[PDB]
Amino acid sequence: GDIPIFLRSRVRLVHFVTNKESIETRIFDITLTEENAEMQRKREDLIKLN
Amino acid sequence: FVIEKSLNRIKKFWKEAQYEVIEHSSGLKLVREWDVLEQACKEDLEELVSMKASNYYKIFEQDCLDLESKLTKLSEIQVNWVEVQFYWLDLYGILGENLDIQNFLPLETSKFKSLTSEYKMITTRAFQLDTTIEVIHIPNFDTTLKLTIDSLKMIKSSLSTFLERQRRQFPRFYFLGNDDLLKIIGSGKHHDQVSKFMKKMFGSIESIIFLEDFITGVRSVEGEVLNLNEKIELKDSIQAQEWLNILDTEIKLSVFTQFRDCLGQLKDGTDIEVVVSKYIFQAILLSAQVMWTELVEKCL
Amino acid sequence: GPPGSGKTMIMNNALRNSSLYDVVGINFSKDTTTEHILSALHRHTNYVTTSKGLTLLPKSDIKNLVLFCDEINLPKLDKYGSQNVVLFLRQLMEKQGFWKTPENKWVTIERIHIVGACNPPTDPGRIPMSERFTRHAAILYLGYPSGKSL
Amino acid sequence: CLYKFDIESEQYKEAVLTMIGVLSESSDGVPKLTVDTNDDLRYLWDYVTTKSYISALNWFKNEFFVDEWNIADVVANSENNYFTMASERDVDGTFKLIELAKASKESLKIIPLGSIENLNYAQEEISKSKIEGGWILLQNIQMSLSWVKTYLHKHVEETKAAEEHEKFKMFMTCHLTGDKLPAPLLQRTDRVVYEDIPGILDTVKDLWGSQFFTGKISGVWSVYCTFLLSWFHALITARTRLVPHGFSKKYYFNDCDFQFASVYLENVLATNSTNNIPWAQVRDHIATIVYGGKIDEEKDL
Amino acid sequence: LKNCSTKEEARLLWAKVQKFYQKNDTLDDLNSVFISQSGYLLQYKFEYIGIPERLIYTPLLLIGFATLTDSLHQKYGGCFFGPAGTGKTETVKAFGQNLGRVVVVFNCDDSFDYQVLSRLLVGITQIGAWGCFDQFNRLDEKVLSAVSANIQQIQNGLQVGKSHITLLEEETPLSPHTAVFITLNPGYNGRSELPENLKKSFREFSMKSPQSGTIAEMILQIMGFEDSKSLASKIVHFLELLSSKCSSMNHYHFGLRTLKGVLRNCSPLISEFGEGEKTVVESLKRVILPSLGDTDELVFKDELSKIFDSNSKAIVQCLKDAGQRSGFSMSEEFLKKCMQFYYMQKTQQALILVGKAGCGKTATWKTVIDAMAIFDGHANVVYVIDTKVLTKESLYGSMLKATLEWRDGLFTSILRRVNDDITGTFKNSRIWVVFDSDLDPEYVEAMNSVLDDNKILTLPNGERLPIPPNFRILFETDNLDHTTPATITRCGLLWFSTDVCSISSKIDHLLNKSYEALDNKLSMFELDKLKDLISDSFDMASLTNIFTCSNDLVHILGVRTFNKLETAVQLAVHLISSYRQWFQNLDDKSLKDVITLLIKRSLLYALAGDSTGESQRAFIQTINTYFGHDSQELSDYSTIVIANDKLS
Amino acid sequence: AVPFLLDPSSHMITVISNYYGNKTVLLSFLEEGFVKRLENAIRFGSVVII
Numbered sequence A: 001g002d003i004p005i006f007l008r009s010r011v012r013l014v015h016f017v018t019n020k021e022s023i024e025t026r027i028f029d030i031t032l033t034e035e036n037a038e039m040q041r042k043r044e045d046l047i048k049l050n
Numbered sequence B: 001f002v003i004e005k006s007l008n009r010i011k012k013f014w015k016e017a018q019y020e021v022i023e024h025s026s027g028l029k030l031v032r033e034w035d036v037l038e039q040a041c042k043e044d045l046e047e048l049v050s051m052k053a054s055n056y057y058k059i060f061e062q063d064c065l066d067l068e069s070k071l072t073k074l075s076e077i078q079v080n081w082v083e084v085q086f087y088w089l090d091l092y093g094i095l096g097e098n099l100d101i102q103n104f105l106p107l108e109t110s111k112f113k114s115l116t117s118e119y120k121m122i123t124t125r126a127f128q129l130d131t132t133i134e135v136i137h138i139p140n141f142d143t144t145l146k147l148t149i150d151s152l153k154m155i156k157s158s159l160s161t162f163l164e165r166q167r168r169q170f171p172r173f174y175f176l177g178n179d180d181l182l183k184i185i186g187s188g189k190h191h192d193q194v195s196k197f198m199k200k201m202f203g204s205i206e207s208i209i210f211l212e213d214f215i216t217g218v219r220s221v222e223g224e225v226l227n228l229n230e231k232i233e234l235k236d237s238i239q240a241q242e243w244l245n246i247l248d249t250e251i252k253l254s255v256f257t258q259f260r261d262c263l264g265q266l267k268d269g270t271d272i273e274v275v276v277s278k279y280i281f282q283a284i285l286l287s288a289q290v291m292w293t294e295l296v297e298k299c300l
Numbered sequence C: 001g002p003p004g005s006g007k008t009m010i011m012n013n014a015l016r017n018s019s020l021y022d023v024v025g026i027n028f029s030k031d032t033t034t035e036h037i038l039s040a041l042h043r044h045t046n047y048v049t050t051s052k053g054l055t056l057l058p059k060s061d062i063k064n065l066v067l068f069c070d071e072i073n074l075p076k077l078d079k080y081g082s083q084n085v086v087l088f089l090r091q092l093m094e095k096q097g098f099w100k101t102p103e104n105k106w107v108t109i110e111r112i113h114i115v116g117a118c119n120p121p122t123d124p125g126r127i128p129m130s131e132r133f134t135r136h137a138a139i140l141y142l143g144y145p146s147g148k149s150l
Numbered sequence D: 001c002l003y004k005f006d007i008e009s010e011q012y013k014e015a016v017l018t019m020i021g022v023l024s025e026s027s028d029g030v031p032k033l034t035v036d037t038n039d040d041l042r043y044l045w046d047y048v049t050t051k052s053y054i055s056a057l058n059w060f061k062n063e064f065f066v067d068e069w070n071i072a073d074v075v076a077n078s079e080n081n082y083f084t085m086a087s088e089r090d091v092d093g094t095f096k097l098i099e100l101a102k103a104s105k106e107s108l109k110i111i112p113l114g115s116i117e118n119l120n121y122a123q124e125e126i127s128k129s130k131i132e133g134g135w136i137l138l139q140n141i142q143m144s145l146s147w148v149k150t151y152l153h154k155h156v157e158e159t160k161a162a163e164e165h166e167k168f169k170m171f172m173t174c175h176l177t178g179d180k181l182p183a184p185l186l187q188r189t190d191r192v193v194y195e196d197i198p199g200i201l202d203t204v205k206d207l208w209g210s211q212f213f214t215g216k217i218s219g220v221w222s223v224y225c226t227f228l229l230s231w232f233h234a235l236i237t238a239r240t241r242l243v244p245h246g247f248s249k250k251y252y253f254n255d256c257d258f259q260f261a262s263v264y265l266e267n268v269l270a271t272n273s274t275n276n277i278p279w280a281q282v283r284d285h286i287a288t289i290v291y292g293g294k295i296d297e298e299k300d301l
Numbered sequence E: 001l002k003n004c005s006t007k008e009e010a011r012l013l014w015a016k017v018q019k020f021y022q023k024n025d026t027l028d029d030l031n032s033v034f035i036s037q038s039g040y041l042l043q044y045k046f047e048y049i050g051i052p053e054r055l056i057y058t059p060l061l062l063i064g065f066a067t068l069t070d071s072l073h074q075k076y077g078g079c080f081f082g083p084a085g086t087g088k089t090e091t092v093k094a095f096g097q098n099l100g101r102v103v104v105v106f107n108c109d110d111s112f113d114y115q116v117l118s119r120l121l122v123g124i125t126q127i128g129a130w131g132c133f134d135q136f137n138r139l140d141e142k143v144l145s146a147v148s149a150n151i152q153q154i155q156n157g158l159q160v161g162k163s164h165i166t167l168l169e170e171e172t173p174l175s176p177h178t179a180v181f182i183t184l185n186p187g188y189n190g191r192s193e194l195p196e197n198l199k200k201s202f203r204e205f206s207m208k209s210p211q212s213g214t215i216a217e218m219i220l221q222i223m224g225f226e227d228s229k230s231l232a233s234k235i236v237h238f239l240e241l242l243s244s245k246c247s248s249m250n251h252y253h254f255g256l257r258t259l260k261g262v263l264r265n266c267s268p269l270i271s272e273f274g275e276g277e278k279t280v281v282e283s284l285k286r287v288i289l290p291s292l293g294d295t296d297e298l299v300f301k302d303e304l305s306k307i308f309d310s311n312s313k314a315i316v317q318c319l320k321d322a323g324q325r326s327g328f329s330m331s332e333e334f335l336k337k338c339m340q341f342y343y344m345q346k347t348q349q350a351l352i353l354v355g356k357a358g359c360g361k362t363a364t365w366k367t368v369i370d371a372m373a374i375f376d377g378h379a380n381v382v383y384v385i386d387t388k389v390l391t392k393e394s395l396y397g398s399m400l401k402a403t404l405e406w407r408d409g410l411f412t413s414i415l416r417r418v419n420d421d422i423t424g425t426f427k428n429s430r431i432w433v434v435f436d437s438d439l440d441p442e443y444v445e446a447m448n449s450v451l452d453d454n455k456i457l458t459l460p461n462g463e464r465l466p467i468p469p470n471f472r473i474l475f476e477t478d479n480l481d482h483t484t485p486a487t488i489t490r491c492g493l494l495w496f497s498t499d500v501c502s503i504s505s506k507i508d509h510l511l512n513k514s515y516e517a518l519d520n521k522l523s524m525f526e527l528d529k530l531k532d533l534i535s536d537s538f539d540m541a542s543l544t545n546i547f548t549c550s551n552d553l554v555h556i557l558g559v560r561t562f563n564k565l566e567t568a569v570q571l572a573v574h575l576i577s578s579y580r581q582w583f584q585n586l587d588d589k590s591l592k593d594v595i596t597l598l599i600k601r602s603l604l605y606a607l608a609g610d611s612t613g614e615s616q617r618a619f620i621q622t623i624n625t626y627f628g629h630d631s632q633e634l635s636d637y638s639t640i641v642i643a644n645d646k647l648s
Numbered sequence F: 001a002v003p004f005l006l007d008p009s010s011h012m013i014t015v016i017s018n019y020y021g022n023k024t025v026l027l028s029f030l031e032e033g034f035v036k037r038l039e040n041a042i043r044f045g046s047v048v049i050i
Ligand SMILES: Nc1ncnc2c1ncn2[C@@H]1O[C@H](COP(=O)(O)OP(=O)(O)NP(=O)(O)O)[C@@H](O)[C@H]1O
Pocket: C001, C002, C003, C004, C005, C006, C007, C008, C009, C010, C117, C118, C119, C145
């Protein structure tokens, strides 16, 4: 879908999508979650305990 | 005040509200332009519901809610008022006019008259009010319409059922369809108006031959004439659905007769040319076919 | 012709110049109706009933009335590819009359000429006009002056 | 290729690549031949050069080096209540799904969808079997398909609480060549393809088998004739797999054909004498009418 | 059977044909006649058939009878598929006839209501008739879905033996004698198939090779003339040639349906012609030719000669009268198209006339109409509607939203004048509604019921106006690309390949018109002198080269030469006649020079007036050079001037 | 400036909806009465998604 150039300039456009280009990222997450857990956990709570 | 500004304008709109009206041939005054107010009411209602979101709305909630309750009851009657009209109009052509058809349906008609008169009174008072919103204050308006639409639907249903039960007595009627069938049911006085339809329920046969008391035969779309053995006797008052069934059986019986007569002639060894003059096509054909088969059988 | 060719300048000039012809200005739009054209005429015209030609639609006086459709090729095409408003100009030109749409009765035009101006179908926004219309009008190309003229 | 080309050498790649290109009509040429460093590849080219194509193709599968997962292995191992198994019309997986059912946890329910009645009983027994837990099988779902869009599509979808119900599995038989099934409904279910293609002798045995269960409505000659027809069916049936060799197009010959062919035979047998002559008009009916009726191309006739 | 080698061969061949047997046993006579084929038996229902047009016996029709009898034996529906131009529906009909049944037929995608389809099906199951769905392959998703499901309810119930069945949310009883047949026409994708639900309840069979030859032989044989076999082969082979050699065209049908039209339209010509090939030749060029174009006409003629060799005076003298009256010249072509039309109008109720702008399509039907009025004495009422000017609402009519009141449109109102109330007499006259504009699927979809065999106009309120035979419909249009193939098969088609008229003839016609336009408001003294001046001032020999150089040139918004003529003549005439008053005292040389100047100018504008203005100048030189050298030369700015206060 | 959310499956539309609760008012550019129903949301402070 094509929006007017007028909208796209004025507007902050965000892609929530899985384009298959998201796979590289997502299999790493799974890989890391299942391989090195403690640094996936302490990847997540990095802001929490801080 | 973001609110009173809107509420005033809904009111200002509905005090000038007007249905356009043109009466049809006799009695009931119809309304043109339904969708306009059905929309505008739906739109203003939505504006009133969403108003409840406002933070300054709390104190004015009453003055809003009263308007909501009034418009909501207009909507209740609009939804009904339109279908009452639509159904009635559709039924008037079938019921209120033609005397013969309303004759065999004393009942659906007997109800239609009363509904009509009542719907006439209520509408006539309604358009005397010179405003549409005012309609909500008419005693037994909403009730009248709901009773009316329900009753009309009960008639429409009854009619549909009546016809479908009518076809099942002479299933060929399923080829006609409603309009023409009603013409047959009513014209069963005359018997001559049934002839038109004999292409549609048989297709082989075009029209039907009378001695004015009795039915002597039929004539096919080709122009062939099939004379029945037994002429079909008719009395001044007799249902079509009966003698039509007698006819349908007698044309088959008649074809069979011509078949055996002609075939027996050919068996006795008359020339085919002799026969060609004296019988209808179908009979002399099956004759030739059966006899042939027998001959080329022994010839084998 | 191209822009600045002088089409609108010269023809409005010619028709305003002579007393014998008066103009009815119309600017066709890619959305335009037959009913715009008719209403465009109704200020300068009057319907009459004449047993000779039945219903007639002449100008309100004696001298002739010329309808000028500027940007005449712009009106759009039906899904099936036909622009009715042009075919209507055609019906006027070939049959010298038209059906009055609501009442189903034949109208005959009197002392009304149809004339138009436009840019070549080659340009964007312009639509092809059928030879069934254009056969009835003489077509003149109009272009930039001799430049010595300029 | 995707894997090895990464792991293995450039001479490996160009060899496997040229060897594939030979299987295709892409190019024909001898691979860079390394000696015993790559054993398997010499094993592959050996398949390509001796013109045995099947084993050449499944070289990759056996060098892929896996255990393939049986229908049984998918069904049992998979956690989901919904399976659609498509197949060519040539074969149906009902008889297999029966045996897979008897083999584990019983509960075989075969629901044909013929009628309005078969459809009501379908959706009655669905709502019944999903509370009770039995296996429910909807045969050739494609024929009712306006039913699926309205009822089934939403009735699988709108429920994620179907897992909260007992151990219950709904099977849907599909056809690969046939009307497209709604993409969301399909993705919602575990998909499989039923490929199992009987031998000719097998098919003859199974046809011949289904017949003696009918008792005897016929004499001794009809049996001989039933025998022949089983053979004839098995052979035609087989020829359709051949595709351009044998039959020009894909033709499907169902049980409807076999029934009609045998019905004709019983008739021509009952109507005539015990002489062996009637065979003249037996061929022509089966060839031109019964079986060959379906056929538009004169070659195939 | 005679020529069979062996007694066994005879029995086989005997077994492939329908045999008609009669039980001498009992009462219940109507069940006493049955049919044996392939060793399967079928009883004869005695429904009255009349005298239908009976199909020629060919082995394909017999095999079709065999597959159908094979199916019904087990109470499966039979189904036919195969390309358009064989026959299927009509084969099922004859199959019904042979067993003494009238088959009811549903033509599909006829814009039919599902209600009427449902209802007919209910009738057929209760009655127990045989239904046939013509072109079942095309039906809408929801329509086909529902009809199909009902057909399985029926077919299933027949196999099972149910006394009553349930369908569509309607319950009905079921006659054991009910049956449903289906014919399927192919799309570009390949031969159509039954929806999955019915695939198991039917038996599919192919209709392939119609055996056009044997059909033609026997039909030619019942007209009983000359060489039935020879003419058959030559005619069939010839249509075959026509299909092979002539260009592929969307609307060309050389099939068995066209061949039958030839054999049947061959019959009337027999009276004033012989029964020889000559009649066959005449029938062919009457049926085939009108549709064919430039090349394809000469192909028809070339391949016609290669195979078989080769109201006239009255009508042609009336046409000549009609052309002579409107100012039209009678050519080979113009007369040709007129005659083609005249013979079309007798057969075809709706006619389609196709050709480029300025073809003379209008001139043709108007002239042929006018000449029939002369000839037949039947007066003609002509309504010319430019179609796409009006919306469907405006043309056919419409209904008010609320009050459900009907209002007639243009077409319906002028139809009502004809039927419901005739103050005068429309009885003895012919009416012609002419649609001048481009025809699109939508408008004919509305009136396709008119074009139909139903001959009734269908309005949304269900007013169902019948249509008399006095009522004839014309479509004159330039292109057929967007019309329905069905609209064409319903109408007759008259194609205009080239202009009906020679360029000089049109010029001559225009001049006549311009002269007669003057004849009303001017004296005969001036008219004679001037019309002599104009006509003899320019000759076709000069002009033809000019029109030819006009053809080599760049025309912005170009109109072909033939159509520019109207501008040419009318400009010239009016221009010359504008100055008529100064010709009394004018010298004899000077005028010819003046006439020539006024004509050169008008000929310039009418031809090159749409050119670049550089090209205008080049074309002026082309006009001076191709007319007389002595004749007054035209210049860019050249003009005639006359003095203010005095004549000069 | 106004966010423009893009997802092929719109789970994000129910994310915003879960965030603001009942407050969310969902409109479309293709629906008929949209123009007014926007005028309603905007005046009384509803959270809009188009
Ligand atoms: N002799 C002239 N006298 C006056 N103005 C002239 C003359 N020649 C050219 N022009 C100019 O030409 C222009 C006229 O453009 P005009 O033809 O009226 O628009 P147009 O015909 O509609 N072309 P287009 O824009 O494509 O529709 C003006 O700027 C005039 O000043």
